[PDB]
Structure formats: C-alpha cells, structure tokens
C-alpha cells in the first residue's frame, strides 16, 4: 500500500510520550503495511525508542483502539536525527466528538450482546457495534493520501 | 605511543562512511531501554562502544595498543555473546571486525 | 489559564469563561452584557457566600483546576428589584434516569 | 461575542457564546436560519426532547470542544457519569456535534 514503512535501515532515536490519561499500545506499520504492536505506555509515562527513518507509527488506546494524537496528528514518522538528537512525539487525546465520546463510555458499560437492548435508535446500535478499527481506519488514511494531488 | 596514533588511525577508519552501514550499531553505548534489552547488562559484564574508546584513546587512557585492541574485541565479544550466531547485528560486527583486525594486524612492531 | 463558569440564576444559566485575574466587577460586567443588568443589580456568590466586588476570581477559589471548560466552576447570581435584592434561588436540573440493568 | 440562548425540555435556558453553539451541526443549522437568504436569524433555540441535565453536559462540550481543538495544551478527558451517558448520546447523536 501507500501507507507502509519504508526499508530504510537508517536508525533514529525518538522518544514516546504518553501524555493521555489512557494506557497507549504504540503501532508500526511494517514494510507491507501491516500493523505491528508494541509494548504499551502507562499514561503519564514516556519512554526511548530505537527507530528507522521513514517508518510510520500511529498510537491507539490498548484497551479500546480509540485513536490518539501524536504531535498533534494521526502518524508519526521520524526523519533523521540532526547531530544525533532525539525525535519526540507526544501522543494526546485527540478532541473526540461528544457523539465519538459518548460511545466510547457506553461500550465500556455494554457488553455487545446487550446493545440491542439499549433504549435507543436503532442507527445507534450500528455505531456502537462499529468498534474503532486499526485496519478501517488505514483505509480512511490511505484514501486521504492519494487525495493529496 | 607512535602505536596509539595508529590505533587512533584504526578507530577513524571504522567510524568512517563506507564501513556505517554495518558499523552503525557499535559506535554509541548500548540504549538498553531505547532497544527493550531488560537482562543485557546481566549478561554483558562490561560493555563497550567505539564512542566510550574514542574518550579511552584521547584520554591517554590506554598503555598500550594491545590494551585498545582488548576493548575493541569486548565490544565485539560482548555483541557476540548477547545475540544468537544467525542474528543480523552479528553478521555486521563481524565484518566491521574484519576492519579492525586487517588494520590492527598490519600495525608495526 | 482561565476559569470556566456557569452562572446560575433561577432557571437561567450562563456558559462563560474568564481570567484568574480578571476581578468580580469585571464578571458582572460581563453578566450585564448578556442579560442588561448593572453590576450595581447584581449580587454574586461562591456556593451561599457572597463574593466581595474587589476580590479577583483566583482569590474567591476559582482556580484553573477547580474551573475547567469540561467541568465548570459555578457562580451563583441574585437580582436586586423594588430596591431590595432576592434571595439566591438556583433551579436545580432535571435526574437522569436509574442506569439501565445492562448498563450494570 | 454574541450569545444564543438554549432552552431545554424543562424549561431550563443556557446561554453560551454564539461561536460554542455552532459547534453543533445541527444548531448550524437552525440559528444559520432556512435557506440561501441567511435573513431569519434568531438567537434562540428550544428543544422539546432535551432535558436540562442533558443539555448543561453539552454546553461544556461545546466549551471543552473549542478550547482544546488546535490546541498546543495538554488535551484532558471529556468525562461522562453513566447516567447521562445514554441521553447524551442520542442528544450528541441528534446535535451533529
């Protein structure tokens, strides 16, 4: 795919931050673009990480797969270390909608088996039921760079 | 001491371009959190990193170059030791010690 | 930072943010602005504790940490008419429903 | 800054700054009047279904929504007690916000 690492073998430091209130599961993207997990930060947390130049990272809630911020965006990808100084990317909330928001809170109340039966629209039940997704979500991504000229 | 200005010789050559692209892992400490190594200085009794013999080597902190040679080989040796023999890190210390033996061979005596 | 308020009167309530330095004068100053009161018709309070007109809103307890746009601060308001001030009366919210049993 | 006035089912009214009401869709909509003509402009909406506990929870939406989009800061939690976090919903849901 477009969205993917590139084989650089070209190393850069970067420093992860967790400054979310969530336990953050950080996501490379391999040279075929396939998501890989690493280990998670605790909130609050931050951590050194031996990367390459030109690999793509994006960073989820561990527990949910909510999308999180990193400098203020959905990827991150290092360039290279200029005389050796540390790449930093700081991994946020991102402002949810209050309707995201609101979902989020009552999957985490509902088991799937009872949204149905929630007293509630029965469009709702498809949101719930439409868990944030890594592999949608690079899909959306994906579209969103070839749109780019 | 004319040997030590030699071995300066030999550590140039291996921080050099050509040699980077297998060289790069050995010329900084290991970042043992930067690489989630929880047991790497367990293992590696003392280690040693190219950068920590250049500071050696201009700190005339060696007293001969058979002790230079001795702290280039335990960086190696301690690559060696750390990682099993089909892993790619080995593969590229064992030709940067091709370099270093080649020149630290060829030193006068 | 700034403070994030709700100012509460009857059943009348008013989404504004503000400085920690920024005063209380300068608070009904705003309140005038929206609702055409004077700041001489106006009374506000922390709670049930009338808030002195000088004192800066950090001063009368409103911190960004007690203050937040997700969790405001609330600043209670008592209207003066025929020369008198009422009493501070603040309309509570409707209840939420008891949670669902799958929501348990 | 202008101001919208916001009334809930029960009679509550919640005023908050014209540029924090757009954040809805919906209110867009309805403030932003019918049509081309943006003539019909009127500073307050009711809701008939939305009752004030609902609605005071989505005014600090619209505050936290403004003040941490684009924002340099440190963006905290938007908090949701379970009990309003069903209404909340189909109000969330129903405002486009």
């Given at each position: 795919?477009?969205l993917?690492?590139?084989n650089?073998?070209?190393?850069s ?51 949910t ?31 949810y ?9 009552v ?19 498809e ?6 997704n ?16 | ?16 371009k ?57 960086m ?16 590229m ?9 080649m ?7 | ?26 608070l ?24 002195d007109?000088?004192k800066?809103?950090?001063?009368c ?22 020369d ?19 929501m348990? | ?31 932003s ?5 943006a003539?019909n ?21 619209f ?11 440190e963006?905290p ?21």
């Open positions: 795919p477009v993917r690492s590139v650089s073998r070209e190393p430091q970067v420093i992860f931050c967790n400054r979310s209130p969530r336990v953050v599961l950080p996501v490379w993207l391999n040279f075929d673009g396939e998501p890989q997990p690493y280990p998670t930060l605790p909130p609050g947390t931050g951590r050194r990480i031996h990367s390459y130049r030109g690999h793509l990272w994006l960073f989820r809630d561990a527990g797969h909510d999308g999180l911020l990193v400098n203020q965006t959905e990827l991150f990808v290092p360039s290279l270390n200029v005389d050796g100084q540390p790449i930093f990317a700081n991994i946020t909330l991102p402002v909608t209050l309707k995201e928001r609101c979902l989020q809170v999957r985490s109340l509902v088991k799937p088996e009872n949204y149905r039966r929630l007293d509630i629209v029965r469009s709702l039940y949101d719930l039921e439409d868990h944030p890594v592999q949608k979500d690079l899909e959306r991504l994906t579209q969103e760079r070839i749109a780019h000229q | 001491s004319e040997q030590l200005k030699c071995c300066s010789g030999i550590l140039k050559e291996m921080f050099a050509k040699h980077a692209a297998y060289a790069w892992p050995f010329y900084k400490p290991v970042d043992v959190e930067a690489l989630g190594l929880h047991d790497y200085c367990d293992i590696i009794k003392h280690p040693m990193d190219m950068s920590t013999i250049k500071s050696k080597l201009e700190a005339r902190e060696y007293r001969d170059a058979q002790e230079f040679g001795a702290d280039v080989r335990l190696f040796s301690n690559c060696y030791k750390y990682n099993p023999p089909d892993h790619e890190v080995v593969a210390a064992r030709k940067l010690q091709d370099v270093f033996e020149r630290f061979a060829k030193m006068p005596d | 930072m700034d403070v994030f308020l709700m100012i509460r009167r009857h059943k009348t309530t008013i989404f504004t943010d503000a400085k920690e330095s920024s005063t209380v004068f300068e009904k100053r705003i309140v005038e602005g929206i609702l055409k009161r004077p700041p001489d018709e106006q009374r506000l309070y922390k709670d049930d504790q009338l808030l007109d000088g800066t809103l950090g001063e307890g409103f911190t960004s940490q007690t203050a937040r746009p997700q969790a405001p601060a609330t600043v209670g308001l008592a209207f003066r008419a025929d008198t001030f009422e009493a501070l009366c603040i309309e509570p919210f409707s209840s939420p429903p008891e949670l669902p049993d799958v348990k | 800054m202008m101001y919208v006035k916001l009334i809930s089912s029960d009679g509550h009214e919640f005023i908050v700054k014209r540029e924090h009401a757009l954040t809805s869709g919906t209110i867009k909509a309805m403030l009047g019918p049509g081309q003509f003539e402009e009127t500073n307050e909406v009711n809701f008939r279904e939305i009752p004030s506990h609902v609605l005071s929870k989505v005014c600090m939406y505050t936290y929504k403004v003040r941490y989009t684009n924002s340099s800061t963006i939690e938007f908090p949701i007690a379970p009990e309003i976090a069903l209404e909340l919903l189909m109000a969330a849901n129903f405002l486009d916000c």
